[PDB]
Paper text:
Endoplasmic reticulum–associated degradation (ERAD) maintains protein homeostasis by retrieving misfolded proteins from the endoplasmic reticulum (ER) lumen into the cytosol for degradation. Transitional ER adenosine triphosphatase (ATPase) (VCP/p97 in vertebrates and Cdc48 in yeast) was identified as the primary energy supplier for ERAD and has been shown to power the defolding of ubiquitinated proteins via its interactions with the heterodimer Ufd1-Npl4 (11–14) and the deglycosylation through its interaction with N-glycanase 1 (15, 16). In humans, Derlin-1, a homolog of yeast Der1, was found to form a tetrameric channel with a central tunnel ~10 Å wide, indicating a protein channel mechanism for retrotranslocation.
Author numbering:
A (entry chain A): 22 to 766
B (entry chain C): 283 to 766
C (entry chain B): 283 to 413
């Protein structure tokens, strides 16, 4: 059927562009600048301009939200397309905004919005069309009230533009193009797609499930930190798909008086049924359904039982799905986790640097940022924040930029001017200031991500690199030969050797290479669960580790419990035994299917109990040799990436003086040399400003800041007052134990 | 409860009838755990109502629960609930049967290995399998949305006749799946046969005489006044057919098997201290005549005063509870107890008492031909070493354990797999780098163990077993030598 | 609860207005300390009332307390109380300005060393100096 195409998202931000596959448009005689009339349901029609796309399939058409609402259509709909190249330039067109746009606006919309928006645009417009123009920091709506020639006309340099008239009242059949949508979410692409398909299947073809007879999911749970747009996601999905989203708030429920409270729920369930297929969102489940031991009275238990009965009794009838939201999937009472109940659980993680960047990009779209933005820098330096944090930061930056403009806006007037507003911009100083009066909310929490450590950042250990490749990339990339042989890949690899050799660096590098999530666990928190809190945390940690599959769980200072095993106290035998039991039971219980690998690191292989050392457990062992010669040079190169330059002395020469030194020692040497260089720069600047100020306000010749010019002097001084912290006794002990374990096995 | 009363008043007046109670533990928890007052009234009303309906009556009561102990124990007198039926998770045979039941109407394509799926989906339930079938059907329909009448109203139920599923859809569904059992005891007959183990024929005969013999001829046992001892201990080097032995003997006896290891025992050491072996032994006792296995039994003996200087807590508690519970085993049920240890010298003689665990068995190292048979058992696999079938190298493996042989075989297999990977990668990037000059794909000789693998394996030869441990084992055996 | 509701609706009729509430910990402690049920209803009602204050009018609400630890964390989300300001104990100098303020009417004789008193009065507060 080369007349109907299914609509999907668009990659072009223009309001009159459609993206198609090249062969399909060639068959239908569609090319660049070709005006096409599109007609669909509601007897609505539009005119658009054909554009090309590679990723767009023949049956699909990329087209944005504006004409979606103009055509009164949603995603996946079929449309009638006809090449109609009979358009004529408009002559006199009366266009008006909507009533809810000029509130305290005034000014001239024409020269600021209509004049630039319609310059060389040649948008094919139709009578009754509505469109949006991005203001200085707002969004302005505009609907044509009359056109000439009607209804087909291209905006032309020769037009009689009538912007006069009251902003027309909002149409009440469809609200507006202002509410949320799929285009307003950042940092949750995978889970967004999952939820999108799992709800698109039932909500678009209920009769399909009626005939087929399968049971659609009856409850979906979302868990994550507060203020991450979970409610935003639910509302946007409901609005885009087309439903009767009916939010219920937990806090207002128990604010009522006993039975009436749950009656409300019943009423909600009632309006769930006789309102066509629709979606129900419930918030703060823990506030209404805490753990059993948390409950103390009888009203709470009655409420929980009432909710359970109401939701369990719902067996199909109206195609109603339940969306639940919570902070952490542990505070909820377990009974509401069974089959026929909330079973499909989705995490909402903290956005990464890229997620923060894209969210900030979304939030700053309406405003008029100055031409100096470094959004990547802000995104990477604002780690530990959520979407609400970024929105607040943008709002504060805009507000401060406004505040440092009072001279232009000295009391202004009760009806502000639009030209003045659009004449302003926000600079990077405003962003830095907003950062100064800013505070993240994540703070103390676990972080999951794929790091950026590369192989070249570490010199040497090429055999170790090859072994890591063999033990990581091989099982995942071609399990076919593994199953043809039947050999079960191992999961337990441990590293031992001198400290500060970047073994964690190797773990991060291999995680980056495998492009899988990385999770680190450090000895401090291990001891933190050793006392005080029990082992229970470890449990969900593994669950979290199992949640982020594929992922590489990392352990650092695994001998800390071993260090507490034998040390200056030696009194925590029971807690250490509990730790060992919990970790062993979690690690051996994982399914071999999961692409989850465990890495252990230590520098005291002599104290680790061989109970962990066993087939089916951490069994693979790797010694990390100390840096040597060219390796140090490579390290000397790696830490020299940095920024400054010291092209005065051979690095290999310094490696020759620093033979038998730890890599961390080399990094310390480089750091000390750079500290000396910073001191030299500081003292030179101080001397030059002092000599410029002792001379009265003397600006004769500015002494440019010297290029990094480190000599042999600073390097020699650093080498003098810094030595190899590792002594040869440690090396001999490591090597003798290595040989003992080598020939004892 | 009026409605409950209503139910009862309509239950008898409606001919013979059956009454089911859903989630009983939600109604009758333990008395102390109750906090309000209405729940106690409800529980008492229920008890009175169900006890008072004795008369003649024709109504039977059904009550379902997850944790039998979680309910209030008072409602277990005669006339009240007295007969308990456990519904455990199914097995691979049961899983396959249930899958057939759910897919009896499926017009599936003839490309699915239901047996492989059933073996793959261990630790699941019937609901899990039903959900898997539903999602597999959904995936199959989704993969072919375009041609079906999505544009029109729903299909007239004839295009769907052309629809079919694939095993790939099943694998994909299994990818987006989550089992629910996970942490749960398993009760079943193992599948390890005597072919899986080599050597120790005398040990096998002794085990047979201990376990099998009493059941067939108990008449002479009672004639001579013989009650076989329920208990045995194993000591020897680690990783030398210890769990394998128990699995094989349980399989031959065709009885259920239950295992628990030292990590679990030390888990019950603190935290959930004690009060756990009781329900485990009760579960075994109510279960069919089966076998109980105690691995790393010495762990508590290793932990009571071994190397840390503990607080003197569960060290006695767990052992005393175990001894008290096993002393309560008054024959009747034919369940056997087996313990395994690697440092028996630390075990206190309290357990080593007649009536308690008394039989002692030392496990020696394999002996060449025994080592050869063990290697052959481990070398089922797939590749075959034709020229050199691991004979002279097997000769020089004196003093190694079966675990060592398995490790060597696994290392050889994985290195051969690595060789195959690198050879195939070489072939492919040579083929693409060259402008498609060659495209032939002949199978490499990898699936046959080659001698070069044998040298490269024996270069990294592992002397895992230490002769000091062997001498300690033999001197302790002579310390408890039956021959005076 | 009605009274609280009453307060809020009055602000709706009374332009941008300031709503000040005192001793929140006395009425909004952590749920661990909450033993009865009525307090839970009160907290839920106030949370619902204040969270529904989106747009409405230009009404600003602030609260007085002693320790944020004693406050229930649920009243820490975005849109709720997020701005945090602490009032530290004044130094000797601040004591000096406080004394100057409070002694405006007094006819001090030519022997008063306010600085000396401020130095000697470490560990006091404004109420202390006023008394
Ligand atoms: N991924 C996101 N993209 C854009 N804005 C986001 C995102 N996540 C959060 N926000 C912003 O945070 C606010 C959402 O607040 P909201 O009350 O909906 O929070 P929530 O995370 O859905 O749930 P809860 O309020 O229960 O914590 C809005 O200002 C929204 O712009
Ligand atoms: N290319 C490199 N090779 C070896 N060591 C390095 C390299 N780059 C940095 N290092 C050092 O390694 C340290 C990190 O080592 P780490 O894995 O933390 O060992 P440990 O955990 O024993 O301290 C860093 O402090 C750094 O000084
Ligand atoms: N036929 C056999 N003879 C001896 N050992 C075997 C045989 N088959 C397998 N094994 C090894 O015996 C081990 C049994 O483990 P087990 O002896 O219980 O360990 P541990 O003694 O440390 O508890 C298995 O890991 C397996 O590698």
């Amino acid at each position: 059927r080369p007349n109907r195409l299914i609509v999907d998202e668009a990659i072009n931000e223009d309001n009159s562009v459609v993206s198609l596959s090249q062969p399909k448009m060639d068959e239908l005689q569609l090319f660049r600048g070709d005006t096409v009339l599109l007609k669909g349901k509601k007897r609505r029609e539009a005119v658009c301009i054909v554009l090309s796309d590679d990723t767009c399939s023949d049956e699909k058409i990329r087209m944005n939200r504006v004409v979606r609402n103009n055509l009164r259509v949603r995603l996946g709909d079929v449309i009638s397309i006809q090449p109609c190249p009979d358009v004529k330039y408009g002559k006199r067109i009366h266009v008006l905004p909507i009533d809810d746009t000029v509130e305290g606006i005034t000014g001239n919309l024409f020269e600021v919005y209509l004049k630039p928006y319609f310059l060389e645009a040649y948008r094919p417009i139709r009578k009754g069309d509505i469109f949006l123009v991005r203001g200085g920091m707002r969004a302005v709506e505009f609907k044509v009230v009359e056109t000439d020639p009607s209804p087909y006309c291209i905006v032309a340099p020769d037009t009689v533009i009538h912007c006069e008239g009251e902003p027309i009242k909002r149409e009440d059949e469809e609200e507006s193009l202002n509410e949320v949508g799929y285009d307003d979410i950042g940092g949750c692409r995978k889970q967004l797609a999952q939820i999108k398909e799992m709800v698109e299947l039932p909500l678009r073809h209920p009769a399909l499930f009626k005939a087929i007879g399968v049971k659609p999911p009856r409850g979906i749970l979302l868990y994550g930190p507060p203020g991450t747009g979970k409610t935003l996601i639910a509302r946007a999905v409901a609005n885009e798909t087309g439903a009767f989203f009916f939010l219920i708030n937990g806090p207002e429920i128990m604010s009522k008086l006993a039975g009436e409270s749950e009656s409300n729920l019943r009423k909600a369930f009632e309006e769930a049924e006789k309102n066509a297929p629709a979606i129900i969102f419930i918030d703060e489940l823990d506030a209404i359904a805490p753990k059993r031991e948390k409950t103390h009275g009888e009203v709470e238990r009655r409420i929980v039982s009432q909710l359970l009965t109401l939701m369990d009794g719902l067996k199909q009838r109206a195609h109603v799905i339940v969306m639940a939201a919570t902070n952490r999937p542990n505070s909820i009472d377990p009974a509401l986790r069974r089959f026929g109940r909330f079973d499909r659980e989705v995490d909402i993680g903290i956005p990464d640097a890229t997620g923060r960047l894209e969210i900030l990009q979304i939030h700053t779209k309406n405003m008029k940022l100055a031409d100096d933005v470094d959004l990547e820098q802000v995104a990477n330096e604002t780690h530990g924040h959520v979407g609400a944090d970024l929105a607040a930061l943008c709002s504060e930056a805009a507000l401060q930029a406004i505040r440092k403009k009072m001279d232009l806006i000295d009391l202004e007037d009760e009806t502000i001017d639009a030209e003045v507003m659009n004449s302003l911009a926000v600079t990077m100083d405003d962003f830095r200031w907003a950062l100064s009066q800013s505070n993240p909310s994540a703070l103390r929490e676990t972080v999951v991500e794929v790091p950026q450590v590369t192989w070249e950042d570490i010199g040497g250990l090429e055999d170790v690199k090859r072994e890591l490749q063999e033990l990581v990339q091989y099982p995942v990339e071609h399990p076919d030969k593994f199953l043809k042989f039947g050999m079960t890949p191992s999961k337990g690899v441990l590293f031992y050797g001198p400290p500060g050799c970047g073994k964690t660096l190797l773990a991060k590098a291999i995680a980056n290479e495998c492009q899988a999530n990385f999770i680190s666990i450090k000895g401090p928190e291990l001891l933190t669960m050793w006392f005080g809190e029990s082992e229970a945390n470890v449990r969900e940690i593994f669950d979290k580790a199992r949640q982020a599959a594929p992922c590489v769980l990392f352990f650092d200072e695994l001998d800390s419990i071993a260090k507490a095993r034998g040390g200056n106290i030696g009194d925590g035998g029971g807690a250490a035994d509990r730790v060992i039991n919990q970790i062993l039971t979690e690690m051996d219980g994982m399914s071999t299917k999961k692409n989850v690998f465990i890495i252990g690191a230590t520098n005291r292989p002599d104290i680790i109990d061989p109970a962990i050392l066993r087939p089916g457990r951490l069994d693979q062992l790797i010694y990390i040799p100390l840096p040597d010669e060219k390796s140090r040079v490579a390290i000397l190169k790696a830490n020299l990436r940095k920024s400054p330059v010291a092209k005065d002395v051979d690095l290999e020469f310094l490696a020759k003086m620093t033979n038998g030194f730890s890599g961390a020692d080399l990094t310390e040497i480089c750091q000390r040399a750079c500290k000396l260089a910073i001191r030299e720069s500081i003292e030179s600047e101080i001397r030059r400003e002092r000599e410029r100020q002792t001379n009265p306000s003397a600006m004769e010749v500015e002494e440019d800041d010297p290029v990094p010019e480190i000599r042999r002097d600073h390097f020699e001084e650093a080498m003098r007052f810094a030595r190899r912290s590792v002594s040869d006794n440690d090396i001999r002990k490591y090597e003798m134990f290595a040989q003992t374990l080598q020939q004892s096995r």
